[PDB]
Amino acid sequence: NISIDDAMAATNLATYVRLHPFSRVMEWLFNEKVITSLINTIHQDPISLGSASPDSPLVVSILRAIQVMIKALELQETYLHLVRPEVLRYQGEAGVRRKPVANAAYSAFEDGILSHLSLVVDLGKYCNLGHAELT
Amino acid sequence: FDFINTDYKWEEIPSPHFTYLKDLDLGPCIGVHYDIRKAQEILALKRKEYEHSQLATPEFLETVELEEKVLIEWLTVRNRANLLLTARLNLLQAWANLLLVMIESNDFKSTPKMAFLLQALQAILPTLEAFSSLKSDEAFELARVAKVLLWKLEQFTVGNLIGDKLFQLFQLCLSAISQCSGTPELRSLYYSICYRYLTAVVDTRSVTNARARTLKAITLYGDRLLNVICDDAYGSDTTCQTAAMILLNALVHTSRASVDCPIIDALNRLNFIGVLVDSLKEILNEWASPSQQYTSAKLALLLQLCQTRQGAKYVLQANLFRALEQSGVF
Amino acid sequence: IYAKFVSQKISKTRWRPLPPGSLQTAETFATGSWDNEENYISLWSIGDEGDHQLLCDIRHHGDVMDLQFFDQERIVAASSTGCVTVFLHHPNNQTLSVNQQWTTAHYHSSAPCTGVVCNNPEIVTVGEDGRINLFRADHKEAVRTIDNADSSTLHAVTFLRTPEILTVNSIGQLKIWDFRQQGNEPSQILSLTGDRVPLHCVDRHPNQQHVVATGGQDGMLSIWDVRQGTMPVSLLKAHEAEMWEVHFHPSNPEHLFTCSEDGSLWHWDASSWLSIEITSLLPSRSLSVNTLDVLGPCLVCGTDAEAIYVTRHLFS
Amino acid sequence: ILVPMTVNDQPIEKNGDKMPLKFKLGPLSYQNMAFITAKDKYKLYPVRIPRLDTSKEFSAYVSGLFEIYRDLGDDRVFNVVNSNFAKEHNATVNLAMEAILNELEVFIGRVKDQDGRVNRFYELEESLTVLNCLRTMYFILDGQDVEENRSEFIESLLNWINRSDGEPDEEYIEQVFSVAGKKVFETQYFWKLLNQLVLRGLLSQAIGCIERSDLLPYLSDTCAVSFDAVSDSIELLKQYPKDSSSTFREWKNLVLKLSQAFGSSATDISGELRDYIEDFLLVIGGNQRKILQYSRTWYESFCGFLLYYIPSLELSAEYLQMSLEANVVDITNDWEQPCVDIISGKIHSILPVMESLDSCTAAFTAMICEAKGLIENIFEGLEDLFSYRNGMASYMLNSFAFELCSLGDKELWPVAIGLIALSATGTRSAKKMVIAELLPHYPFVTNDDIEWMLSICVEWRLPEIAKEIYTTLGNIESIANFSLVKSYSWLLFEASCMEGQKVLNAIVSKDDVIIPQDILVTNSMRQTLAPYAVLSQFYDREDWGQALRLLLLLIEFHYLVLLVAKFLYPIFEDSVATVIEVIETKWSNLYETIIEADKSATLLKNLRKKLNFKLCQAFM
Amino acid sequence: MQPFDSGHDDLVHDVVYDFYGRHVATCSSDQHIKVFKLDKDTSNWELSDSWRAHDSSIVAIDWASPEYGRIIASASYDKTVKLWEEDPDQEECSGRRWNKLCTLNDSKGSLYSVKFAPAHLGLKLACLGNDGILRLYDALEPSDLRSWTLTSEMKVLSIPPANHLQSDFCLSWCPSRFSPEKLAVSALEQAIIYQRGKDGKLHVAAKLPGHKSLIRSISWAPSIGRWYQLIATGCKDGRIRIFKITEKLQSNLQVELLSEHDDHNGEVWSVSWNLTGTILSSAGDDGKVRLWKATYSNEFKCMSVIT
16 A cells, blocks of 8 residues: 555555554453453363253353454454554554553463463363364 | 376466467466466556556456456466376375385395386386476486386297387487486486496397397487587586496497497597597596596596597597696606 | 369459457458359358368359458448349358348449448449449448449449548549539549550558559559649559559558459568569469458469469468 | 758748747647747747657567567566576576667668668667677676687677678779789788788688689799698688687687798798788787787777687777777767777666667667666655656656657557556556556547557556546447436436437347347436337237336426326326326426427316326226 | 648737647637647648637637537636537538637636646636636536636735736646646746645645746646656746745745756747656747756756757
């Protein structure tokens, strides 16, 4: 766009990136509270999933959480590359009052989850349920 | 061994007319992987420019659309053909390695396995005849297997089939050397095959017929063939120049057995004897080691030319007495 | 070059035009015959001495006096009977049909139609009745007829820029007409003075709408510029008998082709006619060459020896 | 450059009130205009831009060069399959250089043959000479020495030299083979012209000039010794090596042997012929002193040096110097100095001058010079191309394109746009903009021309451009072909009026197959409906269906309503009544006129008809 | 290409090319407008039509974009501006080939110039006269080529003294399609540039300083390829001037002077540009026309002199 195309459509993409809530969601994903709640929701007893029904809300919630984690792991690079610098430049140029909710120490999404060892154990134990989508 | 088939013509592709978009190449498209978006953007820009030109834009739009729909399938077919070609190459390499490991590590008798040997020869004959000068990748795997096979060698019937194919196999080698096909590595294997053939097979009415017909093939090409061999000598490669130098020894040797010789005469016209005597200088610098064995064949060849009466004329005119003095070897 | 013998004297030969944006060279041509009880219009293709395939033919009543392609599938013929006919080729089943016709295009009793030219949707004809017609595809009657346009025999016609045309006659006059005009007199007459030598053929330069070439009874080639007074710009000695056709090469008009009653076909190479080397292409034993057509590197011609000569490689 | 506006009628004379001259550049290079705002000066003077090329030969030249440019592919660029990319790059580039040279030769030819002015021929040949020299020095050996490829080099060199100037022209061969005051051929002239031939590599001719007078005569008789020299010398000449730098090494050997032998031997010939034969053998042996002695121009010297002394470009620096000490550069022609510059390393600063000789040649020259990597973009910085920001070559090419746009030759427009599109520098959007501004000026006439324009609007995505072009095309049959919103509405209204008044097009809306395919909007649909209604009318229930369709159309849409009322009156159940009612609810000069035409008050008649219909419904 | 007679009795003021360069419009003091056609066949210029169009001397003329039809505009000393459209259903030379589409009488002083605006802005136009007031007109509905509304009025000069025959005014729009709407205006010694603001009104965005006399002509150059703008002026002080205008007292516009040329030694009456803005032309008292090309350094050099 800026390297080949004109500077007309650049404003459209800038407004899209600034107004779309994807940046705020990604920023929240780097919080310890979110990952703690996620691993608490995924960490459940096996008897419940065994006696539960395939349409149980627990299985659906676990599936949605795994999908959100996959999407985050996929889009973290794109975000850190083409969102953070533009948002920072816009906040520096114009006047915006925002409260940070991300941890600078967590340079990536793996830093906040590498401290959980039971996650892999639970993921492996959940393979004996038979649910195709969850497996 | 049924995966090698040229009837499908995976290399040949029917090129449509492409009256338009012909100048659009696949430069930015290209690990052979031609991206489709790199050409899609170019053809889209070209269509936009043509529409802006305002010259029969509505009618000729379907032509560009169908040309793009043909180009996308052309690219996909090219990618699939490249994938199939590399897969066939890998499979042929694996099969050649397996066959080499089998032939080398085999303590069982050879007279019973002669049947399988002849079958493999019959199977590879058409493969070599079909890829003699097409590509220089499949012949390599099939050229070395024939080399070792020729050295690791009712009886009358088998002896005729072997000698028959060895004669046919001798033709395709000289044919490739006359055209300078493949890399110097592949060109070197052909020298070893023809070397032992002219040294062991030919060397008694049966011998005269084979020797006579053998010289005919060499005379068919003429200077075109010898010119390629003379250029290989004193070259960049270390093994090609060695095999080429030793090969000339067998040619002149077998020719005399057939008081003059046309092989030695051709070398003089190609300026081979001239440059050869010039290299004699500084021989001390050149002389197990690859350089040592190379010089052995060099001086060995000159010794053969000095045995025939006609060689003294061409050799003496080269002023070899002054060439061996500058080196100070004595 | 090579000959094919086709058992009829060929009066006219024309290449089928190539599809827009084709990269191929001409491979299909039409012929018309003369001097038989049964004359024919025939379509032929050349395969890749050549191999020719007769695609189809159709009886033509009268001698074929002239022939032109109107489009890919439509062929216009002029008859000695005065009839002008549009034939339609049906490629799906390789047949020819009559699409439309003007049976009284020329008349006195019957008067030969001597020349036809096409600029789709228009067709212009001339004849021995000195009538000049403008026809349009799918119109039953002439758009315009200039009755008694010329008192001499009209031998040929060309467009200049439609609806302007130029005709040549049997006393060596070039006459310019417009179908919007009042009256039966031309806007301009050009001619060579001295002998009033009949002119048998005319062609317009493909790029210079003001320039025409003509061929005469005396075998001579004349180049004319209709802005440059009443006499030719060039007069060039050529054949030993009548010149029957003259064609500028359509894409490189520095090349021009002429044929004659004396049995020759000449390739003239000026590579300009206002703003020359000449090669005679047929053998010394030829009878009248009545007709030729050139498109790209392809030449076809027809002779009174019942022969068609072709080359697809004029320049290679 | 001073050119006469009109070498016929000059509009001024004395300083008699310096008149207000006015000039306006036209959209076409070859058609501009001048005039004067003064009393009794009412003439218009069409002027074409000084030194403009309108010829066909030129456009042919341009096309050929664009072909070479296009065909160069990725190789038209230079990257500042590993060590071969370099060698093969030079291979193809060097070849392109030959192609350019050729195209220019052809062009020059066609200019000498079809011409009014031959000055153009001369200038183009000069351009060719300089280009030959450039190739010979940078476009064959790729920085290596002659041993790298003796054949090609000597071929180009020998070519360059024998196309630069005409001499020795055969008009001078006979000049001396005619002149006397001496015995046969043995004056400074014959030999000078023999040596000249040798120095230029013209060995064939050289030999000929010998077998012309005293090969066998005076020598085979007088001195049998020098006869053998003069003879096997001609033999060595017969076999001057041009492929092997080895064979040459040995050749100069036999030559120096011959020159030594003859050097000290039986002198059975004239005092002058003695030396006259020695010099010939020295020159052939490569004696520097002699090679300089028998040279008429510096390039003869330079050429000789390379041919007979030492075939190494490592000595060119010295060769040129000696050559120039012998014969200074001849300022008569424009090619010599540039050649001297080429040879001596400073290739650059030639583009402006070549641009003066011919813009095109200069453009592509700069281009191939960039391809070789002899000139590059030093800039390092404003959202566009036509500047110093990119290359000097990019600049010259783009300039040429723009210049082509005003030439008005639609054949070259593809070359112009292509030139811009392939420009190795500049954003796709920048080019987009440039094309967006140029294309509208394309001199289209045919259908194909337009389709080409459109194809370029597609290829570049210029919908606003295409929309404009088409708008220009739109401005009864034409209207039918066209069938912006307002215009469509008007077309609709017209169609409705025609229907109310009441062929192939109408059927297509409801050769033929092709048309149906092309067709495959609201206005169109309405017209189709009207046509269907009329067809139904021509063909009781059908009539009712048609009337219903008509009422529906009226509801969707004054004149139409009136036509409908007229139709209803002419015809004169619940659905019908409902429709009539809706019409009454819906219910100027043009409408009144239409009503009058139909009769040949309206509201009253309508009300009466409605009442009648209601009565009919009640009876049913 | 030999000269030809216009057919005018009184002095001719302006000559203008159509878009394709195949047509020409002429206007003179004999109150006539002539249109010439360039015959394809015979490369000669031949009168297409002539007609009386004003009650006074016609000074300026101009063609509209072809995408709006065949339209010509004229300005006269009779304080009016008239618009005409060619009716192809009339014989040439009949005097009835161009129908008046409208008349603009708002000007209360004679008019010296009229220029159509770039097509990418619709049928638009400007005019300037003695009243020193520039006026913009718009054909809002491209269907009604009579519906000419007045888009704007700007006071260029403020106090024009009632006793001066010495008056000159010139107009020239910025042709550029990818640049904000703007146009140049010359008034006596002054030369100022107007630009469309965010408020849809014209504002003075800059001035072209240096003129020490009357500005006889000015024209904006096509900026195809460039990122800057170039406008040239032919002054009475005998100098051609070329200004480089870049947009990066209240302006967003920069103003450079690229060149000055006195080669004419006398007044420069006409200044014109290429279709690509690649060549610039100038004419003056010396009875000579000069063609200028730009150097690699962006200076300007005379590539030829016609006379």
